[PDB]
Amino acid sequence: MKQTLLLVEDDKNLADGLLVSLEQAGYECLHVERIADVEPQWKKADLVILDRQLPDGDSVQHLPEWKKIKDVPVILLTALVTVKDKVAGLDSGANDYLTKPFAEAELFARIRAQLRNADKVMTKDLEIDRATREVIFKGDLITLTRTEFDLLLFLASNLGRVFTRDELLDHVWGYNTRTVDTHVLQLRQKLPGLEIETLRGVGYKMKA
Amino acid sequence: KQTLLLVEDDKNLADGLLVSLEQAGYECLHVERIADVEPQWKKADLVILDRQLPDGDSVQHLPEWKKIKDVPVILLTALVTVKDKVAGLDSGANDYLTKPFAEAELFARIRAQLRANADKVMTKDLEIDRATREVIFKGDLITLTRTEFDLLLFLASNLGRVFTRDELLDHVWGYNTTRTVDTHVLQLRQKLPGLEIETLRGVGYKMKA
Amino acid sequence: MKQTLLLVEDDKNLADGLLVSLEQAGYECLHVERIADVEPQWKKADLVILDRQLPDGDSVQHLPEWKKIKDVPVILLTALVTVKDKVAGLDSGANDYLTKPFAEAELFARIRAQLRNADKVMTKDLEIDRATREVIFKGDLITLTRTEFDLLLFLASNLGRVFTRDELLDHVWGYNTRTVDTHVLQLRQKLPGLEIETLRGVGYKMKA
Amino acid sequence: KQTLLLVEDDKNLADGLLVSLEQAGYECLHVERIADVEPQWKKADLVILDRQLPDGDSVQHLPEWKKIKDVPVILLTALVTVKDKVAGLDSGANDYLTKPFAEAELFARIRAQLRANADKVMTKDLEIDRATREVIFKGDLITLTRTEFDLLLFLASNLGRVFTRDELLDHVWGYNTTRTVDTHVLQLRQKLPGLEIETLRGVGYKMKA
DNA sequence: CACAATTCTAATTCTTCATCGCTTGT
DNA sequence: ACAAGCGATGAAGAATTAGAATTGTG
């Protein structure tokens, strides 16, 4: 019961308030205010909420080439009026729509219904299927726990990315110190040929 | 090719919208009552429902239909109340419309939900039949309750797909009680011997084969 | 030990969805749109939410006589952001203020903060404290269940009120048929001398 | 008679605000560091706290301060994001205010929080010492783990009252996982035989005394 | 009265935390 | 070599599935 999430919005306290309810909801969040920054986080993202009027042009015009990267449930949430925009937003690749002042439970409903190969995460000699929660290393499946599988998968999708151990507490356990090492050592000592290059202070990324 | 379906008792606008939809390329199906929905649900690849039909409300019968063919169910009604948009979409509904609608708004929500036998299952061990609502494990006709008959069917459709106990009370029961499922499988190990249901610590339950 | 709630807002959509994620939350709600309609819904409540934009005048000018009845946590929220209005809203009896745009979680945080003699609701030969959930009837103490005690004190606060059998179901059972009859019998058969006057195939009511 | 307190390292702004309260008449205290924030917590009927402090954060140590006296508190900080606002309010706060503010705004929020031996307790058969974390239950000396002492602590504080297991996790354990309390009382019947703990099937637990 | 959800309850599978010692660069 | 930091060690305290009569109920 855990997936990923993305956000795009320039509004300040409304993009802030929404991302509090979702981190209280249990879906990890990425927040962006520049189309120049949406290319990095797209592959990481399984879902996208968007706004229409923004810097670097109208976002819907920059949309379809990101759809071309991944078939991702994309919802344009924005203040605008015409049904012409509804056709403008949904003739292209898109899978719903909303509008202006709204209630936050409305958005939570339209995205909950959309939640219900691409399901794999392949890196180097490793197949991770979360529909079964099984890992394979050179044709060998080793069973892990819900927390061991969590940290490994977050770094099975994030390649070459380093985050801090305090950040790993709030990214593997969800919203609310030395376990990070004694269990990544549970991983090294139980997965022969583990390719996690330890670092100093700041610590963990996956080369490939 | 492409097929669809619709359910509407109001005559003038329904007849006219399927005309423009028959003018459109799609081949069209239509009924006026809920007893006629289950006949052609299968051959249809997309449906259009309403909340105010003659023979009752369409949501109470919905989730059984998505478990014969999971096709995009687009609700359409005069109920602009947001609590319907909640009960609808948190039942097996994808999207809504407004009671009057722009025609190109409707189609745009048809393509957007199109671009992105069925009664018999074949578990290597045994056989399940949803018509007679029974089970045959190596010849034995096991006696189950509806609760324990229903949780096995949603799992036999997605075997090997482990899911948490919180995402099953929203899938066997109605969406939106208590903490129970641990005892509902314990009875199925008690009466179906050697049934491959692996239990994971802190994760969930799943069927391997 | 769940409790009550109340709402005063003429704006319909933002009062529509606001009560959704509260019914999703687990507190029953009351929906008002006139100050002449605010008077009757007060005593039954531990909490009160209020708007300053109302038909039939300024809501703060009808405020202290509601404080007289019960000292209730009554937040305010409006398009009036002036600290002068904050002094107006808070010199008089209240506990908080807010702003038109928010996270729905801000209210949720600012209502969980207020929850923590008046615990009782007392009727004919009946003493019901919700903090212990024992019934005292003519002096006798008698056991109940989770739902038995919940519907008994439901009709204990509501004097002479009548809800339909379907209305009693969604109220005492989780959101989103014959038991209402058989359980009110497990109420009569438990305690004799209970003024549940059955009506015409319709509803039920506790008179006094 | 009416007392209150303040916590801030900022020098002149704190000086001008406590003088206004002394101009307001409310007898007040002030501490500049967390080193002495704990001593004078008892004498105050209200506390104004700032998280921006040189010797660390304040919310990370908030709940044990309220756990000694349930007096309302207010947070004042340069962190005006809603994620900081809800985090403080959910971790035991009682109100909130922005960083740059007017005076009567504070005052009106001082009265609004005013108009509506705390270390040892003695109950039947239990004579509890919270400082040394020891209990003498029926003549014997009992010593168990920490969480099993904070659990019999908030119950020993609000005893005779029931609380659902959901309302204990955010009240005894760290908020800002269900099969636990069902087992945490079990060993309380193993180590404290004869404890006066009734249970409510479907509801929470309580101490009968 | 049948059916179902509760509390035990009993025996494990996992986090977290000190301690030595060990891996990086300073 | 020194000086922070990072393997490892292996526990002990949390969770985590399994039975039995009880309780509640649509």
Numbering used by the authors:
A (entry chain B), C (entry chain D): 1 to 116, 125 to 184, 189 to 220
B (entry chain A), D (entry chain C): 2 to 117, 125 to 184, 188 to 220
Task: Show sentences the authors wrote.
The response regulator VbrR from Vibrio parahaemolyticus, a member of the OmpR/PhoB family, regulates virulence and antibiotic resistance genes. VbrR is a member of the OmpR/PhoB family and contains an N-terminal receiver domain (RD) and a C-terminal DNA-binding domain (DBD), connected by a flexible linker, and can directly bind with the promoter region of exsC to mediate its downregulation. The VbrK/VbrR TCS is activated by host-derived nitrite during infection, which leads to the downregulation of Type-3 secretion system-1 (T3SS1) via repression of its positive regulator exsC for maximal virulence.
Eight molecules, corresponding to four VbrR dimers and two DNA fragments, were modelled in the asymmetric unit. Two dimers (complex-1 and complex-3) bind with DNA fragments in the forward direction, while the other two (complex-2 and complex-4) bind with DNA fragments in the reverse direction, which may be due to crystal packing. We focused on complex-1, which represents the active conformation of VbrR dimer binding with exsC promoter DNA, to analyze structural details. In the VbrR-DNA structure, each VbrR protomer contains one RD and one DBD, connected by a disordered linker. The two RDs form a symmetric head-to-head dimer using the α 4-β 5-α 5 interface, and the two DBDs form a head-to-tail dimer and bind with DNA half-sites S1 (TTCTAAT) and S2 (TTCATCG), respectively.
